């Protein structure tokens, strides 16, 4: 909160109005794009915010989750390449820049070790079932 507050003061309330959600996700992710594990410098996010998008971890078609637990800040190209897949389906592909094993190790440390992310977000990111299956979509609807 203090780091976000310092960012708002230096950036100005006008620029803080439109990018506060991306700034919060950037702070939550320690400046990292979660799908590529590449650095997102704060100055580039503030100057070129359109190069970074808010991806929904599990597609809302299946998840019905528009909360912060289902949102991550990623590079524009990573959001494009992922499509309507889970991170597991995307990172196991040939379209990803990092392995799912590297991704999983980072996510587990981000949740258990650093506590930066919620338990709900961690389970979204490490979802390894086929979200296109009848049974899996049923489980997502029934968890509500």
């Amino acid at each position: 909160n203090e780091r976000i507050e310092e960012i708002i003061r230096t950036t100005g309330k006008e620029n803080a109005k439109y990018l506060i959600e991306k700034i919060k996700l950037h702070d939550m992710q320690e400046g990292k794009c979660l799908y590529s594990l590449e650095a997102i410098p704060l100055e580039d996010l503030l100057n070129n915010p359109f190069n970074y998008e808010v991806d929904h971890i599990i597609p809302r078609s299946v998840s019905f989750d528009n909360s912060f637990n289902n949102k991550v800040l990623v590079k524009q190209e990573e959001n494009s390449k992922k499509g309507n897949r889970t991170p597991f389906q995307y990172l196991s592909s040939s379209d990803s820049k990092i392995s799912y094993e590297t991704f999983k190790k980072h996510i587990l440390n981000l949740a258990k070790g650093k506590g930066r992310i919620s338990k709900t977000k961690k389970e979204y990111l490490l979802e390894e079932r086929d979200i296109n299956r009848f049974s899996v979509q049923k489980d997502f609807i029934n968890r509500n």
């Binding site: 897949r85 597991f88 196991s92 592909s93 040939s94 990092i98 799912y100 086929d130």
Partner: protein
């Protein structure tokens, strides 16, 4: 149609395998979460689609099938899993895949 082994990851009891089936204009990606070690180490590619996989992710066929986004060398399925492991063993070690 050409089938490529695009990604692999060694697990405790098997291998995670990703295969892209490419024809003239379509790429169909098959995610095999768990393939038994015995099938992998013996290059029993004819048994690969006997095992559970996610529904294929369908996208436009790529203009090039050389290396995946991680940097692993993509091999054709008929060349065998051992070929993929031989060419990418060191890189897979650095990405926690071996």
């Amino acid at each position: 149609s050409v089938k490529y082994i695009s990604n692999m990851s060694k697990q405790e009891k098997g291998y995670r395998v990703y295969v892209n089936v490419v024809n003239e204009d379509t790429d169909k990606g098959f995610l095999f979460p768990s393939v038994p070690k015995e099938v992998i180490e013996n290059d029993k590619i004819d048994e690969l689609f006997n095992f559970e996989h996610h529904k294929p992710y369908v996208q436009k066929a790529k203009s090039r099938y050389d290396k995946n986004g991680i940097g692993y060398k993509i091999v054709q399925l008929d060349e065998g899993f051992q070929k993929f492991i031989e060419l990418n063993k060191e890189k897979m070690k650095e990405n926690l895949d071996y």
